[PDB]
Amino acid sequence: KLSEEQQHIIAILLDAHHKTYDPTYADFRDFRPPVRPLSMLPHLADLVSYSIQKVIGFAKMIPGFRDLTSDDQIVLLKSSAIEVIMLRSNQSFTMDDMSWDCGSQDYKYDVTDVSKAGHTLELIEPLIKFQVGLKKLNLHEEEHVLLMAICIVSPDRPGVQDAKLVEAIQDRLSNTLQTYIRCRHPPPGSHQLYAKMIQKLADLRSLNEEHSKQYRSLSFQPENSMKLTPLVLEVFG
Amino acid sequence: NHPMLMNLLK
Ligand SMILES: C[C@H](CCC(=O)O)[C@H]1CC[C@H]2[C@@H]3CC[C@@H]4C[C@H](OS(C)(=O)=O)CC[C@]4(C)[C@H]3CC[C@]12C
Numbered sequence: 001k002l003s004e005e006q007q008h009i010i011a012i013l014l015d016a017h018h019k020t021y022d023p024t025y026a027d028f029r030d031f032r033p034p035v036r037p038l039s040m041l042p043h044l045a046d047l048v049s050y051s052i053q054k055v056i057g058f059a060k061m062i063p064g065f066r067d068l069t070s071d072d073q074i075v076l077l078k079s080s081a082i083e084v085i086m087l088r089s090n091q092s093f094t095m096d097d098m099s100w101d102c103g104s105q106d107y108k109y110d111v112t113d114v115s116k117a118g119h120t121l122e123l124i125e126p127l128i129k130f131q132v133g134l135k136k137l138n139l140h141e142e143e144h145v146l147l148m149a150i151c152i153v154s155p156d157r158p159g160v161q162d163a164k165l166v167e168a169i170q171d172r173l174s175n176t177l178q179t180y181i182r183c184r185h186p187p188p189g190s191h192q193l194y195a196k197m198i199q200k201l202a203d204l205r206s207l208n209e210e211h212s213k214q215y216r217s218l219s220f221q222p223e224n225s226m227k228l229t230p231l232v233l234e235v236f237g
Numbered sequence: 238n239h240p241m242l243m244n245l246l247k
Contacts, residue, residue, distance in 0.1 A: 234241050234242060
């Protein structure tokens with residue numbers, strides 16, 4: 001049975017998500033336009049930079065997150081950002097044509113589009129397989145927003161000072177997610193669903209690592225760095 | 238060491 005504390009956590013994360021993920025993708029118009037080598041880099045760099053800001057806005061409204069130090073907030077978001085971007089992207093991802101469909105054909109991104117931003121298939125092929133497996137989980141929105149929040153508040157991230165407080169915050173969230181699955185997720189959909197969600201967090205670490213590797217290559221060349229945003233340069237280094 | 242990130246978090 002879902003406690004009062006737990007119901008409140010869910011209502012807050014749902015609202016936090018509704019406030020930071022616009023499913024009409026209205027802002028995409030403000031990005032440097034798409035072009036179909038590094039042809040898609042200006043558009044996707046802007047997209048990612050925007051999405052970083054949205055993730056920060058989401059994170060801020062996570063119950064317990066405000067209690068963390070500024071430094072701890074920084075290290076959690078710096079290491080989580082790419083992963084949460086990949087998680088939140090599942091909402092626009094469609095298995096029909098293995099694409100992110102963000103409202104229009106201009107903002108509909110397939111394997112070849114997202115490969116035109118300096119990243120190879122060593123990231124994109126596993127990213128796309130991740131999106132398929134995650135989509136097959138058929139998560140309730142409540143589960144989706146809990147998983148993103150759990151991903152952000154991970155005690156093992158490099159450079160974390162107050163790991164025990166980070167763990168305490170995450171546990172509250174984990175326990176909520178587990179209880180929610182038990183109470184509100186009907187079998188068979190619910191079968192080992194928690195274990196499968198936590199596995200997605202493992203997959204994301206692997207994707208983050210590969211993204212890091214390729215970001216270093218991309219960004220070693222100043223003419224490519226030039227095409228990013230200052231936020232992207234700060235967050236990804 | 239991350240001014241923009243800090244600004245957006247405060
Ligand atoms: C379009 C969707 C988001 C859709 C949604 O939110 O619903 C996002 C989600 C994950 C994103 C990818 C993450 C990894 C890569 C980051 C890179 O950016 S870079 C140079 O490091 O700054 C641009 C290319 C890159 C391959 C991204 C392309 C755009 C993707 C696929």
